[model samples]
Target: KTHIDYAYELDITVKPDSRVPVFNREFATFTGAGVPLFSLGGGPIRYALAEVLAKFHARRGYYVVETPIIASTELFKVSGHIEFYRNNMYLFDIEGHEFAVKPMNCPYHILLFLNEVAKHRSKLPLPFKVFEFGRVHRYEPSGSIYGLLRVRGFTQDDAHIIVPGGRVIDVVYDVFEEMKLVLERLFKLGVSSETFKVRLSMSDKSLIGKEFMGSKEEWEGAEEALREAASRINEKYGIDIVELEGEAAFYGPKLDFIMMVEESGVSKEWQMGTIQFDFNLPRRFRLYDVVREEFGIEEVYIIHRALLGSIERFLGVYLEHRRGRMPFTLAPIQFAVIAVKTGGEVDREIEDLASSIAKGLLDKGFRVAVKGSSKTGLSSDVRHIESTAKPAVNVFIGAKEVREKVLDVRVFDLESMKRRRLAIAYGDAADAVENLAAVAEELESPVRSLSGQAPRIPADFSFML
Candidate 1:
């Protein structure tokens, strides 16, 4: 465990400022910031993860796609989220006008699909994955707040894929693989168990939209498609996913990512991701395919996804698991270079040397800082050290070393300090700059290997109306 959960023992009454609703007494806040309580959301790191996942997971890659952060109420009406997720929603008024802080990105995403529908060409089974790193609002009961693991205003790595009907099973399986890959990278772990729990959820028979599109044949046909897809996926993956007797939404059956997190050697289950198949929305929106040699263009089959899950909640749990020291790769600041003063004459010279090394490394992409006294102009050093940064490297400034034109650079690994002599020049270590660069080069190797995939242009295009 790396992250320590502070919210757990904190005055349980203090709410976190967040998007997810937090309730204590009469005060309820969203995410972590809504009520002045800080967000355990891992703010910047969360966004970085979302961006990377979106880049890697999509079958059709879109880069820097600015998915809108807000949506209108009308969008949900067509998508059925209004009905399906009514209870976990947040409603509000803006400028005397009605608007909803979105609880999900799907409906608005669908709207974007419609607006740019022409750009979508169904040539050769193209799969388009669109994603958003945006905050969604939900109102869970106070008990549901559950530390940082669950919340009201959370940022989901929400994505939707429009796949060709014929290859749905193949695509679904591939997506499952992609999900596994992402989890492995982000969590530095893998799922120990996989399961399929399917069940039928019947829509309102009394009401009239359609029992799978207003026909018994349509209902059976759609269900058959889902069942077959599930079967193919199960057979290929060889994972036991049971058909749960009483668990499903009326529209379709779906697959869930059930992962177990090991805490103190005990396994705890968490549903980290999902892929839902839906026939309802396409029919409602009159989606169809008109291809030659085909039985006319029919509605598209949607594969809705939540791969990385909610960033805030996921980070919260991750932090708790880590007990607070986020992994070095994900840490906000990976290194802290301190210019410790060894003695009198070396103070100013050593400090100057340290400052130069800091500036050079910073310009070369390393987050760096200098710590020296007023005579040495290391005034900024105090503020840098006070930060909650777990720096990996520290550089010391000593007059004896500076006069000899060499610098003392130390690398910290698991509480063991290893020191090296960096070259010096002009009574101060100017040669140490090269030494720093060499160390930086070595540090970047891990990052290179960790980046497993190459960049590819996506098959879809977007525009603003």
Candidate 2:
């Protein structure tokens, strides 16, 4: 066993403004003041999360939309957020005109819908779906600031489906299925009706005077629609949906996904995903659709949904839930190759061999890293790699292995807390590449069951030896 260094080299720590470190280590450093934020790391873990969501969204036929981060104050006023949500907004003035950093993506998305696509209604189809993964800023009181969970600045995986009012529930139903696959099948994070619950956030009637916007009939209709849709979703997918008053947004009722998990011996809930039905925005912004116009539809229902509410918050919760042991294909560094020494300075031959192997793996679409030196022995290097990268696979090349034309590969067994090693010959580059690809495939395999069964590894790992 290698004696790993416990102290991380990065300067990521709990600052006065940050209640928790933004990441596991200083991989992404926190900056700014008051409401702290981190510069996103381009490392393996971030990439893995990005790749998973991007692929999922693309397959679901959601088109990407980009909007400005800052907009005129009048934009918010039109969206009805300035009246109800002014406390949490960051407003500023420029050249005698007031401006504000966008607290949500919906307003901009609405603008884009009206300006770019909706205007060209004859050219496009109905139920236009657009998605955006970008930064959104909100003002969080100093006391409420907690790492990524309640950051003033965070990236949201926001999406909107502009469907005919009659077909609103259908889109909402599809969103539920999409969220299920994303949380349970892709991440394998043990999400079920038991672990996850939904809240039908509706307007609290008592606070109608000043707290909430929209008419009483509008709120009732929106809530009724969501209630019916939630029941259908429950019957079809077996998900739990509960109703909550006084929790709806100012303009609409929403379906909020609440994930229950134990932390520090207490059961805590995190709002991971949400699907909101906005009836007021379309009419307020006067967003007309050709499909709706032809169908004699007065209102085009805009459904706001986010699978991963905030990318940063999702990752933060995920790292903790998985105990920082992300899956191989999803991990930032899938494999770490370390050169070892038997009795002298790390041999040039071993370093060269390690580099070649890493390059081959990289070309095969695997994230790989090479780390070793004469001063850092095999044990220390292995320990360091395990600590930092927490790689699913670790390969060590030594003088003997280089001379023998073989490599020692160690694959982590998440269940047993042990590692399985095999000596595979790498004399031929093509043969080595084949064996490595096999290993990669095994590592990417989904866990057979959620009952702690280890991933299926090849029965004969050393067949090529």
Candidate 3:
């Protein structure tokens, strides 16, 4: 949760900021800042979103990496972002040495790959993949900054692949498939595959070598490869892949994924993720393939991919799309355990049971809220939860229910976006704390967690669709 209280309790040596003023100064909080900041409630939701993405990428064989937040200005110059995207970069000078906060992760990833090549003497693995939840800084005008959508600082679910030139099509197609799997099947970001659209952006042939990098032949090769890869998407999914002429970046051709979803009863489309093929960066940095130098496949292609794109912007639109009803895995509060007080000895037992349930879910890496010793009725508790918590799962306990050994659990359905109620026995799937956590995890799983080899889904959970 990154709570200041817990951290201070652990690290007694940690002190307050020395640069801060001694006087008590107060002003507006996050609203006044040019960059957006999250509250305690919203911060955990973002962390959960980031954690899920990290786990997803890890399972896909991508090496999650960390990079410096700022770098020498020459780094971007080599990547050619300095030439075309300098205006958006946050530049500064430190001790007369020009430095800049990175606006993107491409340059750093290139450096990492280059080091890998040199370290391995170019005889290393082919199609090496690296992923980073990179925090980037951009110079959005103060007036244009709007919430998380257009913040000055944000994290991106960014990834890059160094694929041999010969296998570019294969790698690109595979990346697209995974991206679609994440949005459509894994989390239900889009309603269906029909709502997921792909756009292939090609460069203007006229601007070769002047505005864009590389020659006409290189551009043609990249565009053709992208077309071949994107065509596979259409063939596999029966979805149309549109082309946008002259919409490509200066360096290479790209495939931009757009998700069409509804927000507040209005249909909207967002350019959420992108897969771009970069010929210029590889050529610029002398990045070459040593796998088979004789085939004239000396150069490799760089594929820049972002599954959910900018985390901030994605959350901004996603919140609107679901009206703040994030899925279980990404919801700020996954469980809210409320106790129905009857003002008796059993009431104390009910409160203790509610606390036990909440603790179990919390230990399972889920954020939970509890209303154990409260004056509010069941209706009032639920209303408060809906108003403030909006948890994906609600576990309510009353005296009778506690005595009878059955608890009412309300679960949110991913497919229908409806909440259904079920009576889960205490010792059925959730007898032990591990079993309880296992059940909570399965309820979060869309692709479907542990103990006795993960609890089998009971028939009562069919409504969890």
Candidate 4:
């Protein structure tokens, strides 16, 4: 909450070049320039969304790691990416050598793990999990660039788990649990044990010797490991995951998550996150494990995962899922404090009270805006501010509120789909701040900024994507 990058402002207002997908596209993210690139622009909300997700992974004990966006050609050649994923890679001749913009973060994580093992042996123990908000590039045709659901370059909630030999099964269920907390709890995607599906993607039988890496027996062994792990995960969660033939990565099998949710009275599903296994990379890098070597297997295995696949693409789905209403804790601008001007001296007192309340909320780590306006409660100005600005909590201070020494806070109730009023007494001042903070963490209630018949905007968008 004490973010140095984001300023805790005591006052704010809506800018003219306002843009929310459901509202208008006046000043949203940059697109339609030439390439399929976006800025994640428009406001602080996108940044807040990313920050909350990163911190949650940090809480789950994944060490945040940083690596450069570009690496030499040998980096991918040894990782088997150059042989398999050449088409999607962006390779360039820079400084008289072929350098590739990284298409994945796992290779760098592998190097980090290899370094720790060779130099600082006991610095970090087995099952070393490293997470990164990695920005990667992949080639999407220019024809598909106009689509919001796809992007050529984007960041991912990428992570790699380097566990000891034969302990891959123990770590996967833990990853499933963390995924549940994020997708089901934080985002509230309405996916449950029965609603979501897991897919075990295995390699094609015929292409084992050609398309896929490793020997036929090694491929079967890796696939069998996935089946066992999936069975245990299914037993833990009380469901069976289906296997897709010829759907595995070139390296190994993957456990892919398919989230099913209802949007606009119909069921929708998307293949969001994947926990991919890799046997080829470790052997290619010659990372021999002592236990595995004793057991006839020479090297370790890598678990590549991304809970939220791509930050931009996943949020595009998430925005449509909620119809652009973020939960309170995720909203960038949480409060808008308005002073209702009645007369000269009394209006000054009301304005001061509103500013004081805004200051308190800002101190408590809530993004707040204070406004001293003469607009009446039912005036067009008040309604317009409520609609366009999209403030989660609206605080109104007038002569009546001043007399009662309380502020009227209006919060949009999602279940009721109406603005509900609550009163906060200014007696303690700190009480009001803490009470509102509790509200943010309680339910999936937020401003419900853009969608439905809430504000009756003229634009028509049944779906954003």
Candidate 5:
């Protein structure tokens, strides 16, 4: 078996942020930031979220996101995090000045908005959303690294949405709704309250200094507003809410989502989505707008909103929950097509036809593979059938079918043992091979019980006539 290395490698246990020598092993170096060349974490756990998001944008909508890897270090400073986040921050002496790497994507995204808001203001109420799935580094205790569940350097799927504050509630609804659709479509999550709930992540009252922006009144007001929105949504959707205690951030109570999974009737936690609010960034950045018809006015609401949360973490959870079997639309390969008894003129003809079919499939944007007649051994066929392929469609074009001017088309729905007729148009083996594109197009079939092909004519298979 060819071992496909799909896991990311990290060995994050060294000092000087440089090198560590394992007993009897070569020295492994670090990349200046003190993170090991490989920070030991989840062994390259497959995150389906990344793929799902890409598929969503590429296939569903025209989403153009500008990726910014760096912004002014002070961008986060005025955001009031300079002192509060000093310990978690990483800085470097670049030309006798301290430059810090951004720990969150919110500030940079806001910068982009500030750059374009003037030109795009007329496009107000515009559903503007930007996303970036990039790595952000942090300083974690040497012993704090766990599986991908927690890591020092990891990819974050971050997005910032901008719209009229009046419709912010509507935006919140859309965010949760979109997240729900993604979860159901990609993770096969069945609709149920016991499996999912929305909550608010709050702040701890025992912070030393400046942990929260607003006073007790502001915090309570924000939490109540979130609760009210959650209530409206739940009542409209007829679902119950499951709230979490003391989980809110210091800025504002967020609409945190909790997706619970039950294995063997035991419920385990799986966080899916969040409309997390950030009152800190807005206040620190001093964002304001003039009131209509007023001589002068200013206002600022919130900063960060993570509708889908970290794409990487979501993927980790999904891979573990679904055991790597993503839904059909999100899966890498949907089906496998193979030619039976490939070889001589007949085999070549069938395989040639299969190849044509494969190209046609590609045109339709479906992932397909055509195993030539020579590779049509039972073992090969079985292997393909057992592969990651969901519904295996086997097309066996034996010599008889070629001579009879018809193709031996067999559709095997392994997931649902349903066999349906694909067309049989071409005659000569060569003609059939030439019409492969048609065959590929004909692969789709409605699910139904297929009575075995009419018992072969008595005279054809038996002596009885």
Candidate 6:
């Protein structure tokens, strides 16, 4: 397999003071104090992948929700974030009231559910699932800030499943399965069963009273419940699970998916997805049972999950994992059409044909670009596009291609580092489109092997009060 050295290659240069390499200035720019932000070329790829994932979640019965970016300071305070997560918040004042940019979507989703009860109880029901591809802000010091991986502003594929108390374990288990399917099957990043480990993150016992929310028994019970859940998943699926103390959230315990990426000499572990069990947030927000008023099951359970965690970090790691040879659906440019430049009638004709083909692909929901240059020559322009955009296929329009109304297609075999060319006649455009569309479709959506199964909750979880 060919592995591109991402830290060194590419148009962007890395600064000595910061290890993070900037995307091409045109692709991503620094706004203030080296806070990297994306422009058109870079931002769209991230957004595209996020949108695909959100759609997948929606198809799996998750209702897409968009919440406010900023909320009252009291909202975070009530959620215990102001006390335990104040350092990460971006707080400001407006209209003589304290406000904060949201760092996560959990609190807002809880509020959404509670607000539903105020107007009409039947609007929101138990096991209510919702998700958002919303941007969130956090304060990352200059030293810790890195390209895409550790950024102050990032979007999360965040979601929440609010179920009755007894259903929390079931929802969490299902989330674990889905996370595996996404990384292993969907992305095809070689996420084996052995490539993942489960960490049961629990709050520190020393800071139980001072920092962690909920009662001591609540914390202990939540930790044990998560640990049991993790163990059950491991035994059932033959995976690894370990306990990580003092890594839990202020409100509850969580099951974190740790992915091991071994490429070249770089060996790193990333926490991609997390399924957190929050007993405190719902209670603190005073969520009430609307439909079950007669039975009076007022307490609600929230499963906070991010399938790929921060989209930026996931892209960063994936760029390295795939060595910048991205799959078509996830790539910034799926197809690059190069018109061989000779500064003649054939060259002009080729460029026009390339542009028309690109437009047709664009209309069909594929990202395609026509690459042409009279000043830099054909070879240099093609190389530049290959290095920068790293498109899946390159369509070369030469004199023969223009005269014969055919496309000289170059398909790059990333693993073998071999270039294979094919000539597609004008009549065969549909075949080309069908073949490439299948590639993109496979990348955008994974096979639904373990997707819509009912979650299995442990029998003992029901005994917990």
Ranked candidates (TM-score, high to low): 3, 4, 2, 6, 1, 5
Across 75-117, the per-residue lDDT of candidate 1 in tens digits comes to 6677764675666677667777556777777776666666565
**Which residue pairs clash in candidate 6?**
none
Q: Which stretches of candidate 2 lie over 4 Å from their true place?
A: 1-31, 34-52, 83-87, 116-118, 204-212, 215-217, 263-267, 288-295, 344-349, 373-380, 398-408, 411-427, 441-465
Clash count for each candidate, listed in order shown: 44, 2, 0, 0, 14, 0
lDDT of 2: 0.66
List TM-score per model, in order: 0.67, 0.77, 0.83, 0.78, 0.67, 0.77
Worst 10 residues of 2 by lDDT: 2-11
Q: Model 3: per-residue lDDT, tens digit, 258-341?
A: 887664578777888888878777767766544345234654677889877887677666665654566665555566776788
Model 3 collision count:
0
Model 5 stretches with alpha carbons more than 4 Å out: 1-64, 117-135, 140-148, 161-165, 186-188, 202-211, 288-300, 342-345, 363-365, 372-465
Lowest summed lDDT window (length 10), candidate 5: 456-465
Which predicted model would earn the best TM-score?
A: 3
> If both were scored by lDDT, which would come out higher, candidate 2 or candidate 3?
3
**Better model by lDDT, 4 or 6?**
6
The 10-residue segment of model 6 with minimum total lDDT is: 456-465
Lowest lDDT block of 10, candidate 4: 456-465
lDDT of 5 by residue, 46-133 (tens): 2334444544543323243645555566776776657767688777766776677667777777666666655555443344566665
The segments of candidate 4 whose C-alpha lies over 4 angstroms from its true place after superposition are 1-51, 81-84, 121-124, 232-240, 288-299, 343-345, 372-387, 413-420, 428-431, 437-465
Candidate 6 yields a Cα-based lDDT of: 0.66
What TM-score quantifies how close candidate 5 is to the native fold? 0.67
Give the best candidate by lDDT.
3
What does candidate 6's lDDT look like per residue over 1-465, in tens digits?
112234223311232223334543432233454344443445455555555666668777788888999999888888774565888889999999999998878888877766766676655556888888888999888888676678788888899887765665667777876787677655665544567778788888988866777777667756766766777788787678888788887778788888876656677787797888776766676554443562356444667888888876776777766667665545555677666767677776766676666665666667676666553476677666666556667777777776786677777665565567876667444554555555445444443332332111111110110
